[PDB]
Design a protein around this ligand. Structure first.
Ligand SMILES: *[C@@H]1O[C@H](CO)[C@@H](O[C@@H]2O[C@H](CO)[C@@H](O)[C@H](O)[C@H]2NC(C)=O)[C@H](O)[C@H]1NC(C)=O
Ligand SMILES: *[C@@H]1O[C@H](CO)[C@@H](O[C@@H]2O[C@H](CO)[C@@H](O)[C@H](O)[C@H]2NC(C)=O)[C@H](O)[C@H]1NC(C)=O
Ligand SMILES: *[C@@H]1O[C@H](CO)[C@@H](O[C@@H]2O[C@H](CO)[C@@H](O)[C@H](O)[C@H]2NC(C)=O)[C@H](O)[C@H]1NC(C)=O
Ligand SMILES: *[C@@H]1O[C@H](CO)[C@@H](O[C@@H]2O[C@H](CO)[C@@H](O)[C@H](O)[C@H]2NC(C)=O)[C@H](O)[C@H]1NC(C)=O
Ligand SMILES: *[C@@H]1O[C@H](CO)[C@@H](O[C@@H]2O[C@H](CO)[C@@H](O)[C@H](O)[C@H]2NC(C)=O)[C@H](O)[C@H]1NC(C)=O
Ligand SMILES: *[C@@H]1O[C@H](CO)[C@@H](O[C@@H]2O[C@H](CO)[C@@H](O)[C@H](O)[C@H]2NC(C)=O)[C@H](O)[C@H]1NC(C)=O
Ligand SMILES: *[C@@H]1O[C@H](CO)[C@@H](O[C@@H]2O[C@H](CO)[C@@H](O)[C@H](O)[C@H]2NC(C)=O)[C@H](O)[C@H]1NC(C)=O
Ligand SMILES: *[C@@H]1O[C@H](CO)[C@@H](O)[C@H](O)[C@H]1NC(C)=O
Ligand SMILES: *[C@@H]1O[C@H](CO)[C@@H](O)[C@H](O)[C@H]1NC(C)=O
Lengths: 63, 420, 98, 99, 50
């Protein structure tokens, strides 16, 4: 996948992130651990190549 | 100073102080060819002669960029489970609204965090010449979430969540544990709970007001921002220097002269800009090393003062440490240290041991004091007179070895029991 | 000669010595209390007993052997000056800086 | 090392040791033009073409100079009360004349 | 170039001295203003004072 840094996606599977324009990866609403950091909370991984928002950790409500 | 006199406190004060620590600087990246030469191709061919300088600069900047993210992750991401505070915000009178997240704000930040965010504060020119800034891996919302998780964990479970599974504990009992930590018995807190809670709330309010009313409190983070911006501005401004050539713009030299002398002019420009880039890289490396040291200190402080109670003097605030709270700030962290300070001391007359029936009695955990006619045993950090019995004193030897022994009677708690 | 100057320090040696003397007086007269709040006086043998308890030894050990401990401390304080004076490499770091 | 045996100390020794730590170095300042060119005007005119190198050097040296004072203040200035020893220098047999 | 070399050397030595000064400040805070339980931080043996 190719990331054009600091470029709006209209000046070049197309995704628009705060870091830049991402080509070749599909955005997924699911959250996982960060595998390949991209930036601005966005990480990419191979499962095709997917891009997602990293999960801080497992939720736990202490009683 | 004297040699049979002691001073014992009779009251206390809960004090909250602030500590600001930078963590990470701005991640930056450079383009050697575009900065040095630009759109010209002859300049690139001439620059290719100098070797692998641009590769070295790019590698160093990449190393610094990844180190910044490593620093932030080390400082904040210390708990892999995020905790949530219970819906009913009652903790036995302690009132944490000024540090808990505010649902009303869209950013979900505490009022103190919001104040810190607001109190810390040409780009196209830097961007257009081959200099770029990279966004941080962790957004501000994630940092706030991490801090909220840490604070909820330290509120609901004490220090137990830092060394294993989180075990719940009522907040007054946790305060009693932390009071026992510094040598004060639990009954003091269990009898002055209301006063302690009122003092804590007043201290928190004063912290917010003091942070709001002083502009120089956050000098370190502002210094970091100013240093980065000024270094970038100087690097940009270096492009306008002639450096011994005839013109500071490459296009005019290319379109005005013949190649045999244009090569000399571009040689001068190339060497000048290479020197500027090397100087910038070296300064960035040194500043990155200093910031890494600060980040390691911040991580140690978070591990020791927040996730537990520290016995080290002045490490987690002035006075006897009680606990701490973390808050996020642009490019750094702010610690609120809650500590215990004695006050309202009083004179007393003291002796090292008590002689009774030819036996010397020494205190178990306290100290012998005298109000002028009678002798008592008290704690060292709080005045609480008690009758001298065999429970709080132990016997060792006779009365002649020690210096300064004082006659007195030692009550026997079993004496009325067997007598009756 | 050539445009280089050395600037005087903000703290003169006398005021640094004054700071050290203040610290010594505080730690002698009030133990560790003065560092965590108001200074509370305490007889020195009692402070020694407190510091002996701090390491896991009861107070009677200090109280019954006060003269011996005082003599040992005085002997060590006497020895340290000769140790510093008789060895030229003891002060290597500061001289290295200079 | 044994099976059911220990060694218990029976007597003690008070030990005093030294530790030397540098705190601050010498604050120094430089003049870029005077050092590089002296009183020559042509050399200064040529030096003006290089830009803002001298400003960077001055800024770095000033930062070091202020950092030295910050180091000394952090190390020593830790009490805001100037305590005084009592006139009678008796502390139960302990002798502090050497310090 | 001579001046730049001198300045860079001064910067590195200043960083070293700053680290040493921070260590000295920590030692003064912990060993002098109180009793330290850390091993070999304030001298060989069981710490009494400084
Ligand atoms: C101790 O008892 C409490 C009940 O008050 C338990 O809390 C509940 O635990 C279950 C099991 O995971 C959760 O589904 C509930 O949501 C919890 N209640 C609340 C209000 O959070 C707690 O798990 C028990 N702890 C142990 C170790 O048994
Ligand atoms: C210990 O100090 C607290 C406050 O520092 C004292 O409580 C104050 O008492 C006065 C008179 O009763 C009130 O006007 C104040 O409002 C109280 N302060 C607070 C914060 O509630 C307390 O009396 C002191 N205890 C002793 C034994 O002197
Ligand atoms: C906890 O602290 C907050 C903030 O000091 C208190 O909120 C104040 O409540 C009064 C009365 O309801 C309002 O007039 C103020 O405007 C509130 N302050 C803010 C900043 O909103 C709160 O009452 C305290 N206790 C509880 C239980 O929330
Ligand atoms: C020193 O403290 C003791 C203990 O409280 C005082 O003894 C009591 O004093 C009160 C009033 O002075 C009397 O009502 C009690 O009957 C006394 N108790 C006993 C067992 O005698 C003593 O008076 C205090 N001394 C001074 C000078 O204040
Ligand atoms: C503490 O009490 C002891 C025992 O009552 C005192 O020792 C006696 O002192 C008198 C007068 O000096 C002598 O005549 C006795 O021979 C002593 N008896 C013993 C067993 O030594 C001692 O003097 C008292 N100390 C103070 C300071 O009053
Ligand atoms: C513990 O060690 C000290 C010295 O480190 C011993 O003190 C010496 O004792 C001998 C025998 O009485 C004397 O001749 C010396 O003059 C003493 N030295 C000092 C400095 O006072 C002490 O005796 C030892 N403890 C025991 C129980 O033997
Ligand atoms: C404390 O130590 C000092 C110095 O170690 C002692 O002063 C010495 O006293 C003797 C006898 O009067 C002289 O011969 C020495 O010249 C003195 N030394 C110095 C450096 O002046 C002192 O006696 C010791 N004790 C007290 C109580 O001060
Ligand atoms: C205690 O102090 C007084 C005066 O401060 C002094 O005269 C006396 O000798 C001291 N005690 C001892 C045992 O020396
Ligand atoms: C004592 O040592 C022997 C072998 O050296 C070992 O078998 C035995 O278990 C030890 N004693 C105890 C109580 O374990």
């Amino acid at each position: 996948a190719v990331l054009y840094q600091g470029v709006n996606c209209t000046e070049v599977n197309v995704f628009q992130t705060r870091a830049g324009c991402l080509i070749g990866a599909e955005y997924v609403n699911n959250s996982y651990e960060c595998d390949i950091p991209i930036g601005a909370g966005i990480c990419a991984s191979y499962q095709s190549i997917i891009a997602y928002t990293m999960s801080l950790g497992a939720e736990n409500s202490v009683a | 100073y004297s040699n049979n006199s002691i001073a014992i406190p009779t009251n206390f004060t809960i004090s909250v102080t602030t500590e600001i620590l930078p963590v990470s600087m701005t991640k930056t990246s450079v383009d050697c060819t575009m900065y040095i030469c630009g759109d010209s191709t002859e300049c690139s061919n001439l620059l290719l002669q100098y070797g692998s300088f641009c590769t070295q600069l790019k590698r160093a900047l990449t190393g610094i960029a990844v180190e910044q993210d490593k620093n932030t992750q080390e400082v904040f991401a210390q708990v892999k489970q995020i905790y949530k505070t219970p819906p009913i915000k009652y903790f036995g009178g302690f009132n944490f609204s000024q540090i808990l997240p505010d649902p009303s704000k869209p950013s979900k930040r505490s009022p103190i965090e919001d104040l810190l965010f607001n109190k810390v504060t040409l780009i196209c020119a830097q961007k257009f010449n081959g200099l770029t800034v990279l966004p941080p891996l962790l957004t501000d919302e994630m940092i706030a979430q991490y801090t909220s998780a840490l604070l909820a964990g330290t509120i609901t479970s004490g220090w137990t969540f830092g060394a294993g599974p989180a075990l719940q504990i009522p907040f007054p009992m946790q305060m009693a544990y932390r009071f026992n930590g510094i040598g004060v018995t639990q009954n003091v807190l269990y009898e002055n709970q209301k006063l302690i809670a009122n003092q804590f709330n007043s201290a928190i309010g004063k912290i917010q007001d003091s942070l709001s009313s002083t502009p120089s409190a956050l000098g370190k983070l502002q210094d970091v921002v100013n240093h980065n911006a000024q270094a970038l501005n100087t690097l940009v401004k270096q492009l306008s220097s002639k450096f011994g050539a005839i013109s500071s713009v490459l296009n005019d030299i290319l379109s005005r002269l013949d190649p045999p002398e244009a090569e000399v002019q571009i040689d001068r420009l190339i060497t000048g800009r290479l020197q500027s880039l090397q100087t910038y890289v070296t300064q960035q490396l040194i500043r990155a090393a200093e910031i890494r040291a600060s980040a390691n200190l911040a991580a140690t402080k978070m591990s020791e003062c927040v996730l537990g109670q520290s016995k080290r003097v002045d490490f987690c605030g002035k006075g006897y440490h009680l606990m701490s709270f973390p808050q996020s700030a642009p490019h750094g962290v702010v610690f609120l240290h809650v500590t215990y300070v004695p006050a309202q001391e009083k004179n007393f007359t003291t002796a090292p041991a008590i002689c009774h029936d030819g036996k010397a009695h020494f205190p178990r955990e306290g100290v012998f004091v005298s109000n002028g006619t009678h002798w008592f045993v008290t704690q060292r950090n709080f005045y609480e007179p008690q009758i001298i019995t065999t429970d709080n004193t132990f016997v060792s030897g006779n009365c002649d070895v020690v210096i300064g022994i004082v006659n007195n009677t030692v009550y026997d708690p079993l004496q009325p029991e067997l007598d009756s």
